[PDB]
Structure formats: C-alpha cells, structure tokens
Design a binder for this molecule. Structure first.
Ligand code: CL
Ligand code: CL
Ligand code: CL
Ligand code: CL
Ligand code: MN
Length: 340
C-alpha cells in the first residue's frame, strides 16, 4: 500500500515517499528542527530521464577542458577533455589507466564550473528546480529559504545547483577511500541522485558492494531495498549531528598525531577535507567519544537533506550523477551567522 512515509536508521531517519505531496512539510519540519537529515524517495519519476544520461553530457559538452581527481590517491589529472571522463562512465575498457595498468576511479572536478549550471544547461536547470521536494525550503525564492533575504552578517550560498559526477569505488582496498571526504557546509543542502551507472567489462562486481553496505553499518530495512525491490544503489553516506563536530575534530587530531602528522593543537581536520572515516575510525568515534551517526544508502531518485553544520562524507558504490541545491532554512540560520 502507498504510504506517506517510513523510517530508516532504526527510527532515527524520516523517509518521505511522495516527492510532490503538498502535506510533506507537516512531517518534515519536526525532524528538521531537531537537526536530523531527511531522505525523500521517487524524484527520478518526476524528471525527464533523457536529460540525465552520461552519453548526452558527452555529445553536447565533450570538447570542454576540465581537471579530474584520481579518487584512490587524490592526484589531479590536468586539462583533459570532459568526453575522456564521460565515455568511461559505464564502459570500463574506455577508462584512463594508471601506471599499474588498472582502470582509474575518477571524479570530475567543478563541472559545470562555479555558478555556470543555469547558463550552460537551461533545460536541465528547469527540470531539476521544478521537481525539488519541500519547495518552500529548496526553491531560490521559497518562503522558507532565507538565502535571498539576509544581510552581509550571514554567509550566503553561491547560485546553484552544483553537479557531482564520479565513478564507483571497486576493490576491497577502495572500501576505506571517499568519493567526497568528511566536511561540513554552513548552508543547508538537498542532494538528488539523477543517474546510477552499473558497468560492463568488469561487470559482475555485485558482492564487494554488499560487504561495503554491511560494514558501512546500514540498517536491515535498507538491506531489504536491494534484495526485495531491486532498486539501483548509488552511494553510501555517513552524516553526523552539527552538535558532534568538535568531538570529531578531537578524534582526528589524535589520529593525525598517532600517524606522525605535525599539526598545531587548534587546526581543523574537518575544514581540511583530508579524512574519510573507515569502519575502524567510525567504531573509535562511537567507543572513545560517544558519537553515533546516520549511515544512508542513496538509491536512484533519492533526495538527501543535509542540515547546516553537519559533518558528512560520501562513498560511491557505482558511477553516480548527483545534483545539489544549497538553501538557508530558518531552523538552521545560526550556522552561517558571522558573529559570536
Ligand atoms: Cl542545528
Ligand atoms: Cl540543457
Ligand atoms: Cl514545502
Ligand atoms: Cl573530497
Ligand atoms: Mn557537502
């Protein structure tokens, strides 16, 4: 039976089922005021699927110059064509190879660049912005988005949206690597999974994905969306409450010191964007500092809401196209204030 919502993370995470339901705000706002993330499923059913394919991005924009990141070692591949990324998105025999002769796991950096999404891709911009869930919060001029209404005493977000494109992590060694390392944002964000590419060539890569979700601490209900509904899983997130950010800095300064880093006692390991919390570090955070997070699997068409100030990291299971919009809710405006 169709239902308005359900719970993940053993009741700690709201999952809304109908992205365009005019009554969603009634269920959302209680959870949001407490500093919790929220998941909304089904956004892919609202979109024009032909606008969000890797082959279309390659055909239309393939001659642009871009930099890539090697996710395994953080090395930068400078000044290549954007088709060199897109044509290896699903077909492994077309990926750029490292020295060892293996195909690389690549992230496309800052594309489209800065604030240029709307000018470069007007039809994509319209399709996304007209179908975002919780539109009073998430649209540029929504009644509950303060972004356009605040003075310079507040850090204001850039004009969006921002696209996040990267291959899936593959091997057992890759389990400990991030697609996007642990960081925080002073604005709220909504992050939509618009495409998941499950490859061919080294296709049959199903079993390392299940060990990653299990060791990642995913709940039993999330393990059912795979085995029962056959939905496409994109990315594993870990999100932490804004109130736990300083305890996470204390753990990472202790671990940086153990690993022979020489950092001043006040340096900020979250702002540095240099860490990925693997199974070992997530257990140490819980046991030694008393901090629990939310482990979230983002499937095709899932919208993740990330509260301002909340530390979070992202690990792609398969090749992903994500599109994210920043906003400033009244519930979390304290996090972008420039005084006290
Ligand atoms: Cl808060
Ligand atoms: Cl377009
Ligand atoms: Cl709303
Ligand atoms: Cl990163
Ligand atoms: Mn972020």
């Amino acid at each position: 039976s169709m239902t308005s919502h359900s719970w993940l993370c053993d009741g700690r995470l709201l999952c809304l089922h109908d992205p365009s339901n005019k009554n969603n705000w009634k269920i959302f706002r209680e959870c949001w005021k407490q500093g919790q993330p929220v998941l909304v499923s089904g956004v892919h059913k609202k979109l024009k699927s032909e606008l969000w394919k890797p082959e279309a991005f390659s055909q239309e924009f393939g001659d642009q110059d871009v930099d890539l990141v090697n996710c395994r070692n953080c090395a930068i591949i400078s000044d290549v064509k954007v088709r060199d990324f897109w044509d290896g998105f699903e077909i492994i025999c077309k990926r750029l190879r490292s020295e060892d002769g293996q195909p690389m796991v690549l992230k496309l950096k800052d594309w489209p660049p800065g604030e240029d999404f709307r000018d470069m891709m007007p039809t994509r911009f319209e399709d996304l912005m007209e179908n975002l869930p919780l539109p009073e919060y998430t649209k540029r001029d929504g009644r509950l988005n303060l972004a356009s209404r605040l003075p310079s005493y507040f850090v204001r977000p850039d004009l969006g949206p921002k696209m996040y494109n990267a291959y899936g992590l593959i091997t057992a060694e890759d389990r400990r690597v991030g697609t996007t390392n642990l960081h925080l944002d002073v604005s709220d964000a909504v992050n939509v999974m618009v495409y998941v590419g499950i490859p061919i060539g080294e296709g049959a890569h199903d079993e390392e994905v299940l060990k990653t979700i299990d060791e990642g601490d995913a709940d039993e209900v999330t393990k059912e969306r795979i085995h029962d509904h056959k939905e496409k899983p994109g990315a594993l997130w870990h999100i932490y409450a804004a109130k736990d950010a300083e305890k996470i800095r204390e753990l990472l300064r202790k671990v940086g010191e153990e690993q022979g880093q020489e950092n001043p006692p006040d340096h900020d390991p979250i702002h540095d964007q240099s860490w990925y919390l693997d199974q070992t570090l997530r257990k140490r955070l819980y046991e030694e500092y008393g901090v629990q997070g939310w482990a979230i699997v983002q499937f095709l068409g899932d919208a993740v809401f990330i509260p301002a100030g909340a530390p979070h990291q992202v690990h792609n299971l398969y090749s992903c196209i994500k599109v994210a919009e920043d906003f400033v809710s009244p519930e979390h405006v304290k996090h972008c204030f420039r005084l006290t």
